[PDB]
Design a protein around this ligand. Sequence first.
Ligand code: AS1
Ligand code: AS1
Ligand code: AS1
Ligand code: AS1
Lengths: 449, 449, 449, 448
Amino acid sequence: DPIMEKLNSSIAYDQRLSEVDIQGSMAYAKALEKAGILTKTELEKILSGLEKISEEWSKGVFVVKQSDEDIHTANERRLKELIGDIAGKLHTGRSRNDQVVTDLKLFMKNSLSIISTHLLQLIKTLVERAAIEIDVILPGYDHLQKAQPIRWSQFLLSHAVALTRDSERLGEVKKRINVLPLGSGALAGNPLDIDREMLRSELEFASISLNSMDAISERDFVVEFLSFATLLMIHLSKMAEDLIIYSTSEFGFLTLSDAFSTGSSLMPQKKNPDSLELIRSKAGRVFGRLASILMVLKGLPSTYNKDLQEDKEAVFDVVDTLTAVLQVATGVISTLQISKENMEKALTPEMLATDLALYLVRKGVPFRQAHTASGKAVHLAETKGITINKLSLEDLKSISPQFSSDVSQVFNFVNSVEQYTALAGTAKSSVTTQIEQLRELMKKQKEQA
Amino acid sequence: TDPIMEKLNSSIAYDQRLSEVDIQGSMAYAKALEKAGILTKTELEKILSGLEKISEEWSKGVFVVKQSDEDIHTANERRLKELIGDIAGKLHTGRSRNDQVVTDLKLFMKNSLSIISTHLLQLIKTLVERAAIEIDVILPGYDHLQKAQPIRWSQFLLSHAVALTRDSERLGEVKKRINVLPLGSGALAGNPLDIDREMLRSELEFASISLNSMDAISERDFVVEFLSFATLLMIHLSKMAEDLIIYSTSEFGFLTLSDAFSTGSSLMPQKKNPDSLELIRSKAGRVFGRLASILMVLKGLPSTYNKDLQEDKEAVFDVVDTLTAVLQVATGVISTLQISKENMEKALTPEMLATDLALYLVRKGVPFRQAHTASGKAVHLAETKGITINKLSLEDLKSISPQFSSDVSQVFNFVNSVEQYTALAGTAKSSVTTQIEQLRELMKKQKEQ
Amino acid sequence: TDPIMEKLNSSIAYDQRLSEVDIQGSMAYAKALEKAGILTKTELEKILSGLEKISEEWSKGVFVVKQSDEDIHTANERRLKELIGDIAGKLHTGRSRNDQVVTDLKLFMKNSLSIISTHLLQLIKTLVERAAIEIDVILPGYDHLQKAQPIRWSQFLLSHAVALTRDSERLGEVKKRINVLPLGSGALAGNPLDIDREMLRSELEFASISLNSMDAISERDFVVEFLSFATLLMIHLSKMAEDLIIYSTSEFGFLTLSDAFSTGSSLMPQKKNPDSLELIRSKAGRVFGRLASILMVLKGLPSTYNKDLQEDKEAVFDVVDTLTAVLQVATGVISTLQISKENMEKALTPEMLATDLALYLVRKGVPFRQAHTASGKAVHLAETKGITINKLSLEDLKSISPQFSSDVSQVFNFVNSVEQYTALAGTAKSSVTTQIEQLRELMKKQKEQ
Amino acid sequence: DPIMEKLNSSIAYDQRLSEVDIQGSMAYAKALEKAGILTKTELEKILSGLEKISEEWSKGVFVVKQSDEDIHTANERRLKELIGDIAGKLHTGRSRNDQVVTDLKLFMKNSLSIISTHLLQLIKTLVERAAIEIDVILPGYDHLQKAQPIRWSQFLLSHAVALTRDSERLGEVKKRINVLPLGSGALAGNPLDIDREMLRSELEFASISLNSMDAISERDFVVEFLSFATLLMIHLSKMAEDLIIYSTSEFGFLTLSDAFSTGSSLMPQKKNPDSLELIRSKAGRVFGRLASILMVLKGLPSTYNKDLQEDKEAVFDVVDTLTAVLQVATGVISTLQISKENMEKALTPEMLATDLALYLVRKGVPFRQAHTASGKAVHLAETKGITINKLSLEDLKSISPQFSSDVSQVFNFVNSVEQYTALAGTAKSSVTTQIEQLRELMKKQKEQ
Ligand SMILES: N/C(=N\CCC[C@H](N)C(=O)O)N[C@H](CC(=O)O)C(=O)O
Ligand SMILES: N/C(=N\CCC[C@H](N)C(=O)O)N[C@H](CC(=O)O)C(=O)O
Ligand SMILES: N/C(=N\CCC[C@H](N)C(=O)O)N[C@H](CC(=O)O)C(=O)O
Ligand SMILES: N/C(=N\CCC[C@H](N)C(=O)O)N[C@H](CC(=O)O)C(=O)O
């Protein structure tokens, strides 16, 4: 049945595993010779023939045949075409089962190294920008309503901190991915007493799988990777939402560069944040991949089943998505233009009523009564038609004798943010400390490779 | 006000579960307020004594929730005021429901993850102990749910333990990021009174403190992470449930669940319905549903706190209770089930040794393809003669290949079959013994960490 | 035998909500048994009288559940035997918990869907009626959250009304399939006593009866469909919520939610937090989680009944109560919010009419591309001259295109702008009026059901 | 930025809408002529160029250029290359916003027509085999444990019934997709009083969209279709699970044809049900698409947002999956071979104890005593080390005087299944009724 054949066939996409597939075969071939299954000459011939395939794929000259069901079959066909019947001894004791997961894990390890580089660069970009714009203040929001003054850098660092947790998760996922599954056979293990330690060393895996059935049937490494990817996209979807809103003419806090926005010649001042919308939408694209693999795996019996073939397309899509999205995010953050003018202009006296209460608290007035007094000043100012920073000292003392002339220091946005010196707060000293901690964090994550 | 709105916005019905951790969070905060001079020594002693009283009321189940209590935080503060008067009002000085709630939830999850760890490790131990005892049992290994080759029952049991061990490793990783103190982050900009966060960390027993107030109050990574860990864990259990359910059918006849974990009718006494395993399998969907819920709640939310975040609690409570129950039922099922060694061995057929026959020749220098062709001839010859392959005469085999010697009779032995897989992770007895040792060493580390 | 197993397997804690429909199902079944000659007429009056007392105990909230009650079915039968004696035992003859439970759930959902319909239709009517009253209001239409062109505020309200109308239509389709009787399917192969299913249908008021016993007992399509309907409805509400939240910011300043549906502090009386809309938006995630869980529970399950199916009830109850609460809060928000006609009008700018300037030329025969270029030239000229395009003189415009006449001044009028959209579905007043009448008709048709 | 350009670009996949995009433009062109935006002669040249572009794609010779952002741009570019400046008047009053949703609905409408055909064929295949193999009896399962004898046909029809509901849902989704969005403009509607009724008739939609903002921003039609597709895959995953189980050597009820299974020459009698496994896995793949679009749409503000671009890849994947999946399922069901002998041999006397109790119930014995009596009978058989059908009448009469020699009829598997004559039951008359009802249903649905 032609519909069955096409549906079962994976060559159209698993071709991307061409190079890692060859590497796993070179490693296995060398182990077969050490095991005496192949002669030294036979090994030379096989390795030389495998190097030719690698090049054919590398130059984009490899010819796929209608007969090729998967990349494994395709490569064995080509080898035989280049070196003859000796190519048939290469698959001795091996199965497509441990071969395919070996391929995928090598591919993922390479891909995770690339993702890490782009992820760390995004974090670095946010942190550097926070260091440069440390004096900029704007409103901090809750329920998307202006609450209090905060440093723009505190906002940037909040995203950087979350992204560092994603980087930490990436490292954890990479560790479990860096475990050799080759030599598990079809399900009960390799029957030729193959040297798995040699395979590990050759393919550069950190250790080898503990159980053959598990090694062959689990896709924990795929789910794990997809969970890491999804949470990372959630973080990006939130940063995107923040920046799209701040870029509105209504907010007017920042403007995206021409490279990351779209516009019209009829309305030259209108810039659409297409880049951020693309990023936000990928949270769903990536989550969908996580959702599908979890459902594919649910309730499946041991050991290998054809259902597992759905892993490949999900992993490739997410790898490419993450790679593209992280670079665009980096570009957006490094090239956007902020309006310090509009950010400061958005700060209002009404946002300092909480600070007025804290002024009383610092003088020994209980929390409740200080709250009540500040509320009274706010109301009194409203009835007089003025702002609280304009209330006369006499006005204030009519509400509380505790209000002294130094209360004028409350009505200053820099003074407001500087109250937050406790670790992690928005005071400049605290932001400075956060930047030092992140720089150290980036170093040890890059270090851990 | 609107009654429907009030009910929808209110969280007291479910967040009461945080009663004790909320009290613990307030005691620590009280101590720090005294060190900061917001509370006097005497005020501190009275506040602590009062919170201690409230902790006991909840413990004995005599705490009285009032219609006016919108949440657990409000109920505790109301009750503390009823108990000690006006000074109770100084407790919330500089604190927010925003940093209070994530502190409460992380303390709750840390204690819950310790309980879950205990049950997960017991399940793993139970599987490993049974694999060590039933180490000689041999049965069919399956792929595409079709009989493939003989394997040790213990290799099957260890395949599940290995996967659950990765689940335990992930649990530790999630616990680490949960063990970070968010208190002292305020509503979003940090604590305004230079509260000593290191003191709060030590009192509450967290490993470190949060780096950025905005991230600390708005992120729910710790919830997502926990849910991803729990979902993959349920996936594993759904696979093990699928295996046992099938193995427990009369058709397979490999094992029978105990009465405690199955249901039956007096009209068909020998019919045992595996209700326990079906409950377990279905919980994968229940847990995955909570993971999907929270990811959608967080996707695209702006900074910082939004009421959308309140959905985290019911998801966490449900999953914690589900895992605690499910893990214990699984341990019970595994330790109390009865296998049929006879039925398992009877399921092993000569036809399953055709691959071993080809390996027999392979180990004699016969090229893979040719040995594969030869085994096929023997299989065919046996067919036309209405006999099993272990019944073909030596002369008959020799007509096929001259490399078939009399020692070929050892191929037709299921113990000899599984003993081929001595390569690390295979189903040979020595490999199984090794795995048991490795898993025990891994559990030792995970438990002492 | 195992306490954890027992608590996990037991459903009485929640399925108890099916108490009344379970009793109605038993009354209909009792009558059918009497027709089959299984019950005497005298026995039937006793049974029916007994069931009525049980109905009242639940209604008055006096029904006492016992530790032995595994589920509502067992609870009700227990009580019946306590009320009338041994004759109570004849009620379950030929019946199974399998066909009994799905009957109960569909009766419950049919009743719940009727209630949800009323709320949904009320939300829709609220939007339509408000659109009619505020038909003269004009504000910016947005794409990529950037001001694009003037639109009627009513066009915005009606866009949400139209989507919700499709939700109402889907609710109707879902209700039709739920309105099919499964009672009389037995455990899996059918009712063994030639029960009169048509009589059962009539008594319980279903529209038709299930076609196949195995399907009727195992399928949970009706649960899935309801959940899909609920999830799309929540998606619509999450979008309306997002819109309203943004419009209510002080930056946009387009509308203010009433006190009943917002929260705030006495320190910032002008700051109104849209809790109501945030609660609604988050419920999209809560509802989607339930759909996700049931789909995962059902995937790959074999026929016929399995304990996995018990996960359906909690998901249905949650979504039913969530939708009932959210629709009413949504109705309250829409009907009580106050718009700022002044701010909506002030947001309309001349820059938003450059496209209309191009359309002015297109209607006089200027080819699209050239008119666009001409309008672009006017935009640049205004910029250089230091004014806005509505200020360019006729001499200015004629220098761009001789097709500009004195009547071009009519282009610079926001009412004239929205009035260009008379084609069906557009924002012109006549189109908005038409939509309102089309929606009033759809609501009438749907309300009639 | 190259990365940004590549990410924003949709040409790689949206070119699949090449034909419907053209049909949309032709219909639009005709409407422009009627409104006086185009002369009859300008219309003739535009339609001639769109026709040629239609052929280039058909013949697979259309050349996509690095500058093409999407299919809409690619066609307009080529149109200008072919007929010059007049090409530019085509987009007058139109937006890529209402243009793209028009193309997707046209495509989905055509796709749903093809899906319906394969779905109805699958249903027919199940129903007709049920009629032919109506006498076959095998065990019925609950908790995957043998419960009671049932007809194989009742099993086949249980799947046919669920699939008929998927068909009904397909028809419902199709109706809402069959609504014209063209003429909605970028968001406020069409500005030149374009004749939408004319566009509707030309494109053959059943009606036109009610609100421009909704028409351009909603993707309900994508969600609905993915919901229909996901529930259909759930049904197929369940059927796959049953068949995979029944094909094990342990059950031995059936064998798949060589075309839909895989094997090895070393173990000739062993067939792997690869087809069914592929089918089962597609439930996750389709569900993944549903999950992704729901997340994409959640919390988006009005009106158009680039986030909406994610709809196309999900729709294409799911359309192609259902098409292939349904046809493979039809093949599997039509070509599999059952073992009447194995199905029959699996029926056990112990599967009739329930029937024994029912026997007393019809004799007027209360359900509880009937059950207890049958229970005492099973235990007495056990002790005696014999099957319940081996008990003597005397032994039965000692448990309950209601047992008469006619109790012999209870121990017969056909009589067992024949008890279920109530509509929808497994008795032959009820199975016959189901076959008839389903044939009429398919008729009504086909006459869609
Ligand atoms: N076909 C096969 N493995 C397929 C793995 C590769 C597949 N494209 C995938 O992605 O899972 N192997 C076993 C037998 C074996 O190769 O040992 C079988 O199912 O027959
Ligand atoms: N109400 C409030 N936070 C609610 C947190 C607890 C809530 N039940 C949840 O679960 O998120 N806090 C701020 C103000 C504050 O308490 O600092 C607000 O929204 O106004
Ligand atoms: N237990 C049972 N049905 C459970 C249905 C109710 C359950 N709480 C649910 O919600 O699924 N019935 C069958 C047999 C029968 O009652 O006919 C069984 O599993 O033994
Ligand atoms: N670019 C655009 N629509 C893109 C729709 C097609 C897109 N490939 C998709 O799939 O959503 N149109 C508007 C303006 C317009 O075409 O009227 C814009 O955002 O600039």
